[PDB]
Design a protein around this ligand. Structure first.
Ligand SMILES: NC(=O)c1ccc[n+]([C@@H]2O[C@H](COP(=O)([O-])OP(=O)(O)OC[C@H]3O[C@@H](n4cnc5c(N)ncnc54)[C@H](O)[C@@H]3O)[C@@H](O)[C@H]2O)c1
Ligand SMILES: NC(=O)c1ccc[n+]([C@@H]2O[C@H](COP(=O)([O-])OP(=O)(O)OC[C@H]3O[C@@H](n4cnc5c(N)ncnc54)[C@H](O)[C@@H]3O)[C@@H](O)[C@H]2O)c1
Ligand SMILES: NC(=O)c1ccc[n+]([C@@H]2O[C@H](COP(=O)([O-])OP(=O)(O)OC[C@H]3O[C@@H](n4cnc5c(N)ncnc54)[C@H](O)[C@@H]3O)[C@@H](O)[C@H]2O)c1
Ligand SMILES: NC(=O)c1ccc[n+]([C@@H]2O[C@H](COP(=O)([O-])OP(=O)(O)OC[C@H]3O[C@@H](n4cnc5c(N)ncnc54)[C@H](O)[C@@H]3O)[C@@H](O)[C@H]2O)c1
Lengths: 297, 297, 297, 294
C-alpha cells in the first residue's frame, strides 16, 4: 500500500496533504508537527472530509515509528514569518532532531525536502540522517522551472506543459533559466520576445505571490507531489530536483532520473559556457553556507 | 465543458479551488474576491502548479461576465450587531445583484454562517428559483457524525448511514432514527454504545479544529465539491443540503435529490415525534433570523 | 507502493487492468495468463498507452515470484460435466499452489462462476485464512438491482441502499427488506411500484449484455476494483462479497467489513423469515456443489 | 458540463469509453453504433458499473440529436476483421452517411478520427461534413510516437514520458521517426545503441499486439483521450495529430497546438533534409489515395 509522511503541517505541508488526499494518492498518511494543536486540527478536519471524499486515506499524527514503512517522507517544516535563506537559522536548528528521529524510526524510503533554503537543508538532512545521498533530494528548481514555463506559456499562449527547458542552480538566490534548453513549438526559444522580461516574470513571480497572500503553497506542493508519485511508481522520470551530482560535490538543481530508490541516474546537459559558469557559482554559494552551518548541528 | 465560479477566495474558497484543481474537475475557473492582491496571488500560484499537474484548468479572476455560462457557482461569503447585519445583507445584495446581472443561470451553492439564512437571502435577492439556490447545510455536520460513529465502531465513515438535520451552526441535531451501522439501526445497538457521547465527539471535533487552526476548511470545502459534481453530472444523488421544502416554507437541511437543475425532488424521512419536533424548532429559528436580516436590506 | 496481480487476462481481466491503469491506482502490476501471446500483446498495448497517460504503472507478465509482495490478487479464472469439474478443480489447484508457493500473503479476490464454489475451492487449496479469500459474489447483482431501482425512481444508483444476498448465478435474491429509496423503505412504497418487475428488469439486463456482447466485463470488473481499493486503503468498508460466515460455515454473499487483512468483521441484517429461508436454501446449494467438485480433486 | 460522443463501440470504442468512465472524465456520453445490440449491451454494462464507480456519467445510445452540444465526438467505426489499408473500402462507405448525420445533428465541437486509414478518413470526414479543417483532426502518429517512446524508454530504462520527439507522416505506412527531434537524458538520441533496432520495435510493435490478440486498443484509446482532454480544457497543448497544414494542403501528422476550437496553431520543426523528403513522400501517398477514393 502507499504511505506518505509529512513533517511540518503549515501552509505548504497542508496543501501537499490536501493535493494527495483529494486525488486519493496514498492509503496511509503520517502528519508530524511540533505544534500539537495545529496538526490535530488538520487531522480531524481531513477526517471530517472522508465521508464526502471518493477515496479513503488513514491519518495518524506525531508518530515517528509509523514512518518505518513509508515510501516517501516530505519535509515542509520552517517558519514563513522569516521569509515575509534568513530562515536558515530556524530550519537548520530543526534538522538535527528531525533528522535523528527520522533515522531512528527505521525509515528507508526517499526523503523529499521543501524547507528553505532547500539546497542547504537538503544537504544537512543527508548529513544528519546518514541516508545515501540518492535517497535525499529537494524540490529545488522544479518550482522555478514551473514559473518559467508559466511565463513562457503566457507569452506564446501555450500549455505550460508544452514548454521544455530547465532552471538550474540554487533555489531562491542564484538559480537561472538555461535558455539553451528551452524550446517552444518546435523551435529553441533563443532563435525566437524579451527573454529577460520572461525571466523577470519567472524570478519575481514568487515574490508577487508571497507579497500578495503571505506565503506560496500550490506551486511547490504540486512539485513535491509530482516527485512523490515518481518515487512510489518507480517511473524513472527525468525531473529537475536538488540532487548531489558527483562532479558538483554539493547539492544543487540539475535534471536527474527518479524512481523508487531516489536518484537512479544523472543527466547531461550541453550548457553554454555562460550557463556552466553560473552553475558553478550556485555550487559555490550553497557549498559555503553549508560549510558555515554543518559544524553547528 | 465544465466551468466553476468561486466567490470569496479565503480559507474555504482556496481549499475548494485546490480540491477541484488537484483532481482536474473543471476546465474553466472564475475566482472572485474583493482583495485583488490575494486572488491574483492565488491565481498565479495555481498557474505555477499547472506545469506539474496532470489536468489543465484555466483561471480568470474578478470578471463577473465570465460567470454567464458557469455550471455551478460557490459562494463562501458570510449597535454593532445591527451594523453587522446591515453590512452582511448589503454584501449579499451586491454580490447577488451582480451575479444575477451576469446572466448566470446554473446552480448556486452557498457556504456561510448562518448558512440557511444566508442561502435564503441569496435566493431572495437574486430572484433565482429556490431549487437552484442551495447551501451546504448539515452535510458537514453529518460527515462529522459519520466520523465519530465510524471511530466508535472502527468503520469507514462512508459506511455509516443517517443524517444531521435542521439548522447548521446551532439547533441542528443527529436524527439517530436514520443512522445504521453494520446492518443494524444504531438505536438498537444503543439499547443493548452511548449515543450522547458520540454526539459530543462530533461537536467537540469542530472545536478542536477551530482551536488549533482558527478555522475549518477541508471538511466544508469537500462538501461543496461533492454537491458541485452531483450538479454537473446530473446525478440525481440524494444529499442532505440546505433547501426550501414546500412543507417547511423556509430553508433548512434535509435530504433532497440533486441534479443539474438543482433540487430535483424532496425525500421523506419517517422521523420520530421528538425528531419531528426538533426539526420544526430549527425551522422557526431560521425563520426568525431570516425576517430579522431581510429587514435591514 | 501498491502492487496488484491479475490471473487471467481475458475479457474481464483486461477490463480490470484497464480500469486500474486509467486511474493510476497501482504502481506495479503482475499479469498471469496461460496464453503468452495474449498477455504479451496486452502488456505492450498498455505500455504504448503510458506515454499519453497521466499516471505511471509497471507491468510484468507470467512471473509468479513477483506476486510475493502483491497487496491484492484478482483471479478471473472459471462424461462432459465430470470432465469439466475435473479440469476446473485441477486448474484451481495448480494456480492455488503456485500462488501459495510465491509467498503472496495479501487478499485474494475471486471473479468466477460459480464464484462462491470456486472461492471456497481456492481457500481450500491455498490454505489461506478464509478472511483473506473473498469472491465478488452478489456485489454485481446488487449494483444491477440499484440500476433497475434507480432507473425506476429516476435516481442515482449510488443512492439506492440494500442488497442482493446468496449465491451468485442462481439462488441469489434481492433482500427487499434492506432496500431504501428517498428515505423510505421500498416495501412500503410498493404497498402504495412493482418490485417483481424491478427484480426481473435487473436480471433481464444481464441477459441483454450477454446477448449483445457475449459476456459482461465492466460491471463485474468495477466490483473487483472497488473491493481492491477497500483492501489497500484498509477502509473497513461495508461491502457485500462472497465470504465465509461462522453461522453459515460455507461461502455465500452477505455484507462484511473489508480492510487490508480481508474480512475484518461480519454484519447482522434483520432479514424477514422468507429472506432467511432463501438464504439458507442458497447456502445448501453452494455446499452441495462444492462437495461435488472438491470430490474430483 | 462535459459531453463526449463515440461513434462505433468496437474494441477501440469501448476502450475509449472505459478510460473516460473509469476516470469520470465526462458527465454525459452518447454511444452510437450500427450494431444496436452491441451498443445497448455496453450501455447497460457501464450502467451496472455505476453503483461501484466513484464518479457519475450518463449514457444515451444512438441519438444523433444528443450530439448537438457534445464537446468532442470520437469516430472509432470500422471493421477490424478486415485487418486480420484493407478497411479503406469499408470505412469510406460509412463516412458519407455518418458525416451527413453528424453534420445535421447540430454538432459543432471537435471531431477526433481514429478509423483507419486515419489520415485519409480524417480528410474525407472534413470533406463530407464541411466542418472547418481545424475542427476535424485524427490521432495520426500520436500512437506511433507513443510506441517510439516505449521502445526508447525500454532501451534507456526511462519513463516513456521523459522521451521527447515525434514520428511524422502517414500512420500505418510511410510514417517515420524524426530522429533529429528525439532526445533523452538531456542529449540528442542520434549523439548517443542501434536506432534501427529501436525503430523496428516501434514500427512493428502494432503487428505484435495485433497478432497477439487480434486488435489493438489501449494505446490508441489513450491517445484519443489525451486529445479530447486538451480540447475540453482548452489547453493549447502541443500534440502530434493528423491535421491539415497549409504548406502540405493535405492531412498528415505533424505537431499542432490543440484547444477547444481544434487546431489553434501550427508548429515548425527544424527537420533534416531527409526527414523533409520523407514527409513530402508521405503527403503524396495521402494525397493520391485520397483523390483516388473521392
Ligand atoms: N523550496 C521551495 O520552493 C519553497 C516554496 C515555498 C515555501 N518553502 C518553504 O517551505 C517551509 C514551510 O513553508 P510554510 O509557508 O508552510 O511555513 P509555515 O510557517 O506556515 O509552516 C511551517 C510548519 O512547520 C512546523 N514546524 C516547525 N518546526 C518543526 C519541527 N522541528 N518539526 C515538525 N514541524 C515543525 C511549524 O509548526 C509549522 O506548522 C518554509 O521553509 C518555506 O521557506 C519552500
Ligand atoms: N458551513 C460551515 O460549516 C462552515 C465551515 C467553515 C466556514 N464557514 C463559513 O464560510 C465563510 C468563509 O470563511 P473563510 O475562513 O473562508 O473566510 P476568510 O475570512 O478567510 O475569507 C473570506 C474571503 O471573502 C472575500 N470577500 C469579502 N467580501 C467580499 C465581497 N463583498 N465580494 C467578494 N469577495 C469578498 C475576502 O476578501 C476573503 O478573501 C464564513 O461564512 C464562514 O463562517 C462555514
Ligand atoms: N461473477 C460474475 O458475475 C461474472 C461476470 C462475468 C464473468 N465472470 C467469470 O469470469 C471468468 C472469466 O471470464 P472472461 O470472459 O474474462 O474469460 P475469457 O475466456 O475471456 O478469458 C479467461 C482468460 O484466462 C486465461 N487462462 C485460462 N486458464 C488459465 C490458467 N490455468 N492460468 C492462467 N491463465 C489462464 C486464458 O488465457 C484467458 O485469457 C469466468 O469464470 C466467467 O464466468 C463472472
Ligand atoms: N488510427 C489508428 O492508429 C488506429 C489504431 C487502432 C485501431 N484503429 C481503427 O479503429 C477502427 C475501429 O477498430 P476496432 O478494433 O474497434 O474495430 P471493431 O470492428 O471491433 O469496431 C468497429 C465498430 O464500428 C461499428 N460500425 C461500423 N460501421 C458503423 C456505422 N456506419 N455507424 C456506426 N457504427 C459503425 C461496428 O458495429 C463496430 O462495433 C478500425 O478502423 C481500426 O483500424 C485505428
Amino acid at each position: 500500500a502507499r504511505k506518505i509522511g509529512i513533517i511540518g503541517l503549515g501552509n505548504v505541508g497542508a496543501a501537499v496533504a490536501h493535493g494527495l488526499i483529494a486525488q486519493g494518492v496514498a492509503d496511509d498518511y503520517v502528519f508530524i508537527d511540533a505544534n500539537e494543536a495545529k496538526v490535530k486540527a488538520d487531522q480531524i478536519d481531513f477526517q471530517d472530509a472522508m465521508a464526502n471524499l471518493e477515496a479513503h486515506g488513514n491519518i495518524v499524527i506525531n508518530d515517528w515509528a509509523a514512518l518505518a514503512d513509508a515510501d516517501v517522507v516530505i519535509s515542509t517544516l520552517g517558519n514563513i514569518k522569516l521569509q515575509q535563506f534568513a530562515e536558515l537559522k530556524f530550519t537548520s536548528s530543526m534538522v538535527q532532531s528531525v533528522g535523528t528521529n527520522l533515522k531512528e524510526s527505521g525509515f528507508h524510503g526517499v526523503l523529499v525536502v521543501i524547507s528553505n533554503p532547500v539546497d542547504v537543508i537538503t544537504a544537512l538532512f543527508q548529513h544528519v540522517t546518514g541516508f545515501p545521498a540518492h535517497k535525499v533530494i529537494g524540490t529545488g528548481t522544479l518550482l522555478d522551472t514551473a514559473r518559467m514555463q508559466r511565463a513562457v506559456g503566457e507569452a506564446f499562449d501555450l500549455d505550460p506543459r508544452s514548454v521544455s527547458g530547465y532552471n538550474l542552480g540554487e533555489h531562491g538566490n542564484s538559480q537561472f533559466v538555461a535558455w539553451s534548453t528551452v524550446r517552444v513549438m518546435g523551435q529553441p526559444i533563443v532563435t525566437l520576445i524579451d527573454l529577460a522580461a520572461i525571466e523577470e516574470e519567472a524570478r519575481k513571480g514568487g515574490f508577487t505571490v508571497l507579497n500578495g497572500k503571505g506565503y506560496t503553497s500550490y506551486g511547490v506542493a504540486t512539485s513535491a507531489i509530482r516527485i512523490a508519485k515518481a518515487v512510489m511508481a518507480d517511473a524513472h522520470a527525468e525531473l529537475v530536483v536538488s540532487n548531489r551530482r558527483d562532479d558538483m560535490g554539493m547539492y544543487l538543481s540539475y535534471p536527474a532520473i527518479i524512481g523508487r530508490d531516489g536518484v537512479l541516474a544523472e543527466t547531461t546537459l550541453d550548457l553554454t559556457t555562460d550557463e556552466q559558469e553560473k552553475l558553478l557559482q550556485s555550487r559555490d554559494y550553497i557549498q559555503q553556507r553549508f560549510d558555515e552551518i554543518v559544524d553547528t548541528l
